Each structure stands twice: as structure tokens, then as C-alpha cells.
From a paper:
The product template (PT) domains act as an aldol cyclase to control the regiospecific aldol cyclization of the extremely reactive poly-β-ketone intermediate assembled by an iterative type I polyketide synthases (PKSs). We describe here the structural and computational characterization of a bacteria PT domain that controls C2–C7 cyclization in orsellinic acid (OSA) synthesis. Here, we confirm that [name] PT domain functions as an aldol cyclase to catalyze C2–C7 cyclization in OSA synthesis by comparing the products generated by [name] and its mutants. Crystal structure of the bacterial PT domain closely resembles dehydrase (DH) domains of modular type I PKSs in the overall fold, dimerization interface and His-Asp catalytic dyad organization, but is significantly different from PTs of fungal iterative type I PKSs.
The protein crystallized in space group P21 with two independent monomers per asymmetric unit. The structure was solved to 2.0-Å resolution through selenomethionine incorporation and SAD phasing. Each monomer comprises a DHD fold of DH domains, characterized by a continuous antiparallel β-sheet curving around two α-helices (αHD1 from the N-terminal and αHD2 from the C-terminal hotdog folds). The C-terminal hotdog (residues 1056-1174) possesses an additional helix (αC) comparted to the N-terminal hotdog (residues 915-1032). These two hotdogs are connected by a 23-residue-long flexible linker containing two short helices (αL1 and αL2). The dimer interface of [name] PT is dominated by hydrophobic interactions and hydrogen bonds. The Nδ of H949 forms a hydrogen bond with the backbone carbonyl oxygen of I956, suggesting that Nε may be used as a basic nitrogen to deprotonate the substrate. The D1104 is 5 Å from the H949 and the D1104A mutant shows a slightly decreased production of OSA, indicating that the D1104 of [name] PT may be involved in catalysis indirectly.
Author numbering:
A (entry chain A): 915 to 1174
B (entry chain B): 915 to 945, 951 to 1054, 1070 to 1174
Write the structure that this text describes.
Amino acid sequence: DSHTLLGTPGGVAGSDLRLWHSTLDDDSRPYPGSHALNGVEIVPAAVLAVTFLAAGAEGEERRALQDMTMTHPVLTAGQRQIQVVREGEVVRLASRTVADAADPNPAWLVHAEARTAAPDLAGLAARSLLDPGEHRLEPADPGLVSRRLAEVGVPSTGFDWSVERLSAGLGVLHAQVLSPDASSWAPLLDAVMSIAPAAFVGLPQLRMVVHVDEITVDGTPPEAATVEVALDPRVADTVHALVTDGEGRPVASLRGLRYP
Amino acid sequence: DSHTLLGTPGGVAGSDLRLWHSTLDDDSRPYLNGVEIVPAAVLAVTFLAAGAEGEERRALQDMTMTHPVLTAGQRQIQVVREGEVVRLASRTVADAADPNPAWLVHAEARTAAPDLAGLAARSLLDPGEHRLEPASTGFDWSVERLSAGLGVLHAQVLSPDASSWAPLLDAVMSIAPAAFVGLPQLRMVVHVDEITVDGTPPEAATVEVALDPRVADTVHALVTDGEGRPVASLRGLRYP
């Protein structure tokens, strides 16, 4: 209910390794809603992100994430054991079949990994939203926003956010987002990563994020935000995001979201 | 090896760390009044086995025994192999109300490639040269014969259980403090520089124990079969 997959802390004697263990099934999903491909429930990338943020910052101040790879999706179907590992500046999320007498130590599958780093908050604060006029952002019809947002991502969302306004240009979107749950960054991160693939031009494809070069968050999540999402002009299948609060102060950035 | 504290293997994703977990209880001993103490020999064979999970056999070096493994009821045991370092720890049995009690590290050692040609080149000190006059047991071993000199003993030991090295190692580490001159004190080993074992334990053995002439509170041991072929050595047993 923290929106993370961090369960019971575990230690290795004589080692600064940090572990957390948990069991995942359909009745212990750390998020409220459903995130599913035709009845295939997949843990949202936002949950992986906040899990890594929490694991990074446990005995310390908050971290940014770098080179977050999401190689294999985490499914909720049946029952699986989850291990989150912090080893130095590396965090990993793994799962395996629930151990039993016949297989008391099944091998781990590593789903995702990132590196933790000191957040670049002056970098973050020096960002601002692209100028609407300069990039010719036209306000979009609510009905088409809903259809587009549905088309490019998984039909329902994991979390309680919504788009109250959206302006769109060529490979740029500005979305005014409501996010009443401020108990974690997962809802806003889920909004960013659900809205981001709407920026791609051409025919709508269903995409899922598999990599992020950098995730930086600052402070507690606001309940109203503007989410900017912009195509990388040079590298395919890549989007960059900025989140500001209602007064336009930058509160999160996600660089190099990859949606192949 | 039947006398180790190695329980269920466990792993850390993305790491070559090896873990084993077990619960230690008076009902299921792998080998005072209401308190139980794990013999040093059990710690040694645990570390030998943890060292040699992939490989065939390791020697141990710099085995330190800091806190005895004591139990009056139930305790969780963790054995850790991290590269060439092995550690043994214990804690109160976790539950939902206390889900991650802290580990107490009892002992540690380093693993290394056993020097078996070195071991085979050892032999028992000459009885005549050292003027040997012929004169706890939680396991099944016993001393059937003993010759003693100044700071040296040769003890013929019977050890019917050959399912592990723990009984013979326990005999060595129990008989070694007898090598100290002067009035008998109870001593218990807290450090060993090197432990090397080869093959399966014999059921009859001779144990040599000799004071280090130069360093205080230190004893060296050699274990041979009945024909004097070396099967184990323990160098630098420290008994403060």
C-alpha cells in the first residue's frame, strides 16, 4: 500500500547488502486499480520506479535513478516470491517461483535494475516548460484525448490520476493532471509514463516503457501538476518528460524513456 | 557431511553471494543444564562445507570464533559465503511482529585451496626425540592410548562415526589444551590459522598436539591414520 514491492527487510550478516522479500499475487497488488493487457495483469513501471526510489533512499536521503532497465515484465498471475536488492549503488528487482520442499531455492529472474545517484536538483530547477506558442500547442478535444490515451497504453490505469486539460503539438504534449493521492510518487510517475507514448507521431501503437536514462523527483508529490512530454528528435522510440506543480516549479524529470 | 549447520540454500539476485539458513533447536541437533553450545568442530565443518559447495574441498584460514553459538530453545542460523570469506550468524526466530531481528556474527574464516602435498609431507614427531612417556565428548570419540612429553602429546583416538570430520576435529580441539605445561586449566579455542582435511575421516587416528615454542597460548595439531599417513592438520590453534 506504499505502492512499492518492498516487503520484509532482510540482511546478510557481515555485509552492507540490503534485501527485501515479498510475495506477489492478484490479491496483494501494491497499487489500487488494474494495469492489464486483456486480463494479463502487469506491475506498472511506476511501481518499479518507486520501489527503486525507496530501496535507494533507505539509510540515506533521496536518490535519483539512472539507467533503469525493465527487461522482463513482472506478472501478478499466480503466486511469486519477490526480492529487491540494494548492492552499493545498484538496485534490482527479481522474482521466482515460490520455494517448496522439492525446489527449496529456485533461481531468481531479474526483471529490472537501476543505478542510484545523488539527485541533480539544480539541473531539475533550471528546467522549465517549453513555450506553448513556440511549439504551437493546440488544446485537444477531451473525447479524443481519452481515445488516444486509451489507444497507446493499457486500457485502465494502476492509480488515481486524470487529465483535466491537454495541449498537443508536433511530438510535444502538455497535460494538466490531477493526482489526489500524494502518499507516493507512483501516481504521477504512472501518469507521465502512460501519457508519454501519446507524443509519438503517426499511427497509434501500443507501447510499454523498457528503459529510462534518468528519473529525478523532488519533494512530496503535488496533487495538481503539468506533465510535459517531448519526443527526442534524434533517437527513435524515445521520450523525455518534465513535471511541474501548478505554479510551474519543476518537481520531476524523466529523461530517455524508451518505448519500443 | 552430516554435522554441519548448513540448512536451506538461498541466493541474492544478481550476486554470487551464497547463503544457507536453518533453525537450531534442542530437538534437531546436527551433532550444560538447559543451554546448548555448538562445538568448534561443527563450526569448522560448516565452513568447510560452505567453502566447497561448487568445488571439492577447501582449507580454512584465519578461522575466528568470537561468540559461542548458544541456544535455549530456537534460533535462526545464517551461513554466508562471500567470495573467499565465510561467516556464521544467529538471531531470534523472526515473525510478523519482529520480522527482521539483527544478526549476531559468531565466527568467520577465509577459504583457500588446500595444500594436500604439504599435508602429505608432514609426519609425527619422533617419540624418542621428544621423550614421549606413554601414560568435551559430545560426539562418539575416545582416547584409547596416550604418550606425553614436554609440550607434546600423541593420542590414539577411536572415532566410529566417519560420516563427518566433526568428531575427529572435536577430539583434536578437546585434547590440544592438554599440551600446555603447568596446572590444567579449561581452555577453549578462539582462533585457528589453518585447517586442512583430506579424504574421509578414519575411524582410528593418532592425534599429535604440540606447543608452539615461540608464540604463547598456541598449539599445532596433526592427525594421521594408524599407519601415520596425515589426514588433517590444524595450524595455530589459539587457546587464551
